């Protein structure tokens, strides 16, 4: 999206050659209109895939995912952080290593919100090493649901996440693909 | 909001005398259409208040706040969990005791996303004891901004939150008001 690309160029802040900060419009402060466009762009790409539900992870993935679900007319389920001490009957879980925090946590979704008849569209804000995406894929398959694809708002093409993810055979749609972050500048994939 | 009250009646699950679960459409799985209606209702109520920004807290408040922001045409800033062990200046913080998790945590907002020029609409999913609301109000005042009011999706009128905020001179707009959760049933305020 030229709209997303421009937002990144003028508002994004290059933390290092490995991290891009977009707190002004995606990760802390949210630009609703831009989110609507993002959701519409995602819906367009999966319009005829027969998606029945969208799955994301709290909390940055929520806005993009909700707008997408609004356009496609399907519910949105967001995975939540978990680790608690008790018996959670029918709870889909997965271990995810945070790329930005370098810590490991467990994400989860109540089994009751996903069924083997669901054809899911996974959505998330960033794609780096692919940990979060794999985690989501794992949760969806645990419910016996099928996966129509993976929508990413910003993908760092220079990181292994993308290549490792497409190995599974799931269609990966990244709205903005960054080739480099070197020299405090964002260069998109040509 | 009749549409919201019906959702609560048919899908809401009374957990205890103090907690209502609505994981099927508001807190885990999200119903986008309903979120949009909720967003428009809030926007309608504050249509002429001169709102410049919305402030909420991750993660359940995000969806209702974003739709409100889309309708009103303003940005949405969501407070995030923060380690009192961290630093970062200009950072606006508050201490919130989670009604449902029953644990204390620090929430924070980058001071760059709020200015004394702002006129804020605070939004959250539930109102119980007023803990989260008090945290957002503190953060907003820390930035020197003014407050139009607090939009709440589901209020438990039988708990102290609303009375406390009202007594403090804050406008409270709750779309659904519950008078009691006793006997495992939802009874709205008449
Ligand atoms: N803000 C921001 N978050 C990132 C960036 N790269 C990765 N992440 C965070 O890390 C997760 C993606 O990492 P991955 O699972 O792909 O290894 C996302 O949930 C996201 O919050 C980045 O450049 N900027
Ligand atoms: N799902 C759910 N969350 C609640 C309920 N009561 C309080 N909360 C949670 O607690 C916060 C409100 O509590 P308060 O800050 O007003 O004491 C909200 O952010 C919400 O996540 C409830 O009955 N059901």
Swiss-Prot record, chains A, B:
Location relative to the cell: Cytoplasm
Gene Ontology MF, one: xanthine phosphoribosyltransferase activity
InterPro entries registered for this protein in UniProt: PRibTrfase_dom (IPR000836), PRTase-like (IPR029057), Pur/Pyrimidine_PRTase (IPR050118), Xanthine_PRibTrfase (IPR010079)
Induction (record text): Repressed during growth on purines as a nitrogen source.
UniProt keyword annotation of Manganese present: no
UniProt pH dependence: Optimum pH is 6-9.
Signal sequence region: none
Gene Ontology biological process terms, A to Z: purine ribonucleoside salvage; xanthine metabolic process; XMP salvage
Enzyme class: transferase
Highest rank taxon of the organism: Bacteria
UniProt-listed Pfam families: Pribosyltran (PF00156)
Main location: cytoplasm
Catalytic activity as recorded in UniProt: XMP + diphosphate = xanthine + 5-phospho-alpha-D-ribose 1-diphosphate
Keywords, in A-Z order: Cytoplasm, Glycosyltransferase, Purine salvage, Transferase
Entry's EC annotation: 2.4.2.22
GO CC, alphabetical: cytoplasm
Residues the entry annotates as binding xanthine: 20, 27, 156
Pathway(s) it belongs to: Purine metabolism; XMP biosynthesis via salvage pathway; XMP from xanthine: step 1/1
Miscellaneous comment text of the record: Highly specific for xanthine, with a strong discrimination against hypoxanthine and guanine as substrates.
Function text: Converts the preformed base xanthine, a product of nucleic acid breakdown, to xanthosine 5'-monophosphate (XMP), so that it can be reused for RNA or DNA synthesis.
Complex and partners: Homodimer.
Similarity comment: family membership: Belongs to the purine/pyrimidine phosphoribosyltransferase family. Xpt subfamily.
Protein name: Xanthine phosphoribosyltransferase
Organism, as annotated: Bacillus subtilis (strain 168)
Gene name tied to this protein: xpt
């Amino acid at each position: 999206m030229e709209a997303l690309k421009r937002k990144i160029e003028e508002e994004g802040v290059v933390l290092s050659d490995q991290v891009l900060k977009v707190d002004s419009f995606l990760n802390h402060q949210i630009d609703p209109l831009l989110m609507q466009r993002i959701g519409d762009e995602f819906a367009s790409r999966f319009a005829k895939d027969g998606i029945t539900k969208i799955v994301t992870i709290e909390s940055s993935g929520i806005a993009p995912a909700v707008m997408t679900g609004l356009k496609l007319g399907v519910p949105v389920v967001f995975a939540r952080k978990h680790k608690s001490l008790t018996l959670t009957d029918n709870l889909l879980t997965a271990s995810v290593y945070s790329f930005t925090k370098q810590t490991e946590s467990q994400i989860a979704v109540s089994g009751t919100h996903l069924s083997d008849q669901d054809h899911v569209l996974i959505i998330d804000d960033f794609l780096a090493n692919g940990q979060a995406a794999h985690g989501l894929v794992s949760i969806v398959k645990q419910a016996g649901a099928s996966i129509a694809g993976i929508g990413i708002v910003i993908e760092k093409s220079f990181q292994p996440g993308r290549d490792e993810l497409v190995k599974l055979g799931y269609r990966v749609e990244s709205l903005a693909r960054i080739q480099s972050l070197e020299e405090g500048k964002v260069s998109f994939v040509q």
